[PDB]
Design a protein around this ligand. Sequence first.
Ligand SMILES: Nc1ncnc2c1ncn2[C@@H]1O[C@@H]2COP(=O)(O)O[C@H]2[C@H]1O
Ligand SMILES: Nc1ncnc2c1ncn2[C@@H]1O[C@@H]2COP(=O)(O)O[C@H]2[C@H]1O
Ligand SMILES: [Au+]
Ligand SMILES: [Au+]
Ligand SMILES: [Au+]
Ligand SMILES: [Au+]
Ligand SMILES: [Au+]
Ligand SMILES: [Au+]
Ligand SMILES: [Au+]
Ligand SMILES: [Au+]
Ligand SMILES: [Au+]
Ligand SMILES: [Cl-]
Ligand SMILES: [Cl-]
Ligand SMILES: [Cl-]
Ligand SMILES: [Cl-]
Ligand SMILES: [Cl-]
Lengths: 197, 195
Amino acid sequence: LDKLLAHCHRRRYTAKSTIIYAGDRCETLFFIIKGSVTILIEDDDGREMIIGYLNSGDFFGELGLFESEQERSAWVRAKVECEVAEISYAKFRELSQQDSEILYTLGSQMADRLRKTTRKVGDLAFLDVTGRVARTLLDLCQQPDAMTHPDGMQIKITRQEIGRIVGCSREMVGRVLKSLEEQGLVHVKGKTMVVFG
Amino acid sequence: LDKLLAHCHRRRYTAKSTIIYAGDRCETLFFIIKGSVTILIEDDDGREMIIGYLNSGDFFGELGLFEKEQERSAWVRAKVECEVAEISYAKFRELSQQDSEILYTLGSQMADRLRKTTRKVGDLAFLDVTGRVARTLLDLCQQPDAMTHPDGMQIKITRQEIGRIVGCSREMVGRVLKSLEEQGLVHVKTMVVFG
Ligand SMILES: Nc1ncnc2c1ncn2[C@@H]1O[C@@H]2COP(=O)(O)O[C@H]2[C@H]1O
Ligand SMILES: Nc1ncnc2c1ncn2[C@@H]1O[C@@H]2COP(=O)(O)O[C@H]2[C@H]1O
Ligand SMILES: [Au+]
Ligand SMILES: [Au+]
Ligand SMILES: [Au+]
Ligand SMILES: [Au+]
Ligand SMILES: [Au+]
Ligand SMILES: [Au+]
Ligand SMILES: [Au+]
Ligand SMILES: [Au+]
Ligand SMILES: [Au+]
Ligand SMILES: [Cl-]
Ligand SMILES: [Cl-]
Ligand SMILES: [Cl-]
Ligand SMILES: [Cl-]
Ligand SMILES: [Cl-]
């Protein structure tokens, strides 16, 4: 792409700070310069559930950019310290009209997200929670922010976070993770988990 | 006007005909002039699941349009007889470069699908198959094509059709439905959801 636009109103969010609130009416779009964010929605009873993560180089807040406008579709919460660049929907359109290559980057990312989100539907329907938990570990293993470990990879995730990803409570995800430990797949630490392999 | 050769290149598919096979590597996208299509995924044994539906005016086959490739990520099956226009990635790409509003239209449709697919995750999550079968009954109750009933709502559905919605077998749906008639929700050709 060519998103080297000087003007971008870059701001900083410390870990766990909420950047976007689902249901908000905002005509603004974001670009992650550094850090990562968590995408969250509410499930059947209003329980918060994690749909996925976005990283440096990803856009977010974009679903409303293509127009009667609509409300934000999810919460965007900084997972680590984030530096983001904010751009109005209107200003971004004038850049896209001047160079559509910024839209192809955006379009490429929604296709990627649609694919993963489509796959999440298949995982929830075809895998049980234990298989659902196992895929999550090997999924975030390969995804960014994982540290290569002497015995495999180290990822930053909690038993509570897996519960919101796979659709399970913390205690039951903890029992699955305890079983997976003697099965030799993982080792749970304070704020991290080490996937062996 | 749609686009340049929006209707220079039609193709008609009859109901139940597969238009796109998941895993295929092709670089062309489609536009539904008439009819509707079903988006489906499969598990390892061939278990057969509906992700959503698209209708006249929708593009599909677009997820590969942004590569510099990939395989189709899902099956696209004509639900009724479809009239579709076939467009090369190059033609759409050598025409959107001239007017990006046609890109906005596609993007608007990808945004709606991501939102719809995201919501589907939230509803499907935290429930097991039994809850999903029960949910499906209440979701088809509200459907516009449903039917009001003296004792509740009447809906036209098969065990196979429920199995394609929730991602389960016809046999597993039957016992779950058998329990609900005994568990005080239902009476199953047609179905009547009591409420
Ligand atoms: N299923 C998903 N996968 C990845 N990102 C998403 C998903 N759903 C929503 N988002 C992002 O979360 C944002 C919430 O607000 P917006 O709808 O403005 O834009 C949204 C996307 O950037
Ligand atoms: N979750 C979804 N919701 C709506 N449409 C989809 C979904 N997943 C895939 N598709 C469409 O199905 C098509 C299958 O082939 P493509 O990947 O080329 O492009 C895809 C999209 O047009
Ligand atoms: Au910038
Ligand atoms: Au806002
Ligand atoms: Au890995
Ligand atoms: Au569970
Ligand atoms: Au023509
Ligand atoms: Au094809
Ligand atoms: Au081809
Ligand atoms: Au109902
Ligand atoms: Au099943
Ligand atoms: Cl459990
Ligand atoms: Cl691993
Ligand atoms: Cl469950
Ligand atoms: Cl109803
Ligand atoms: Cl099953």
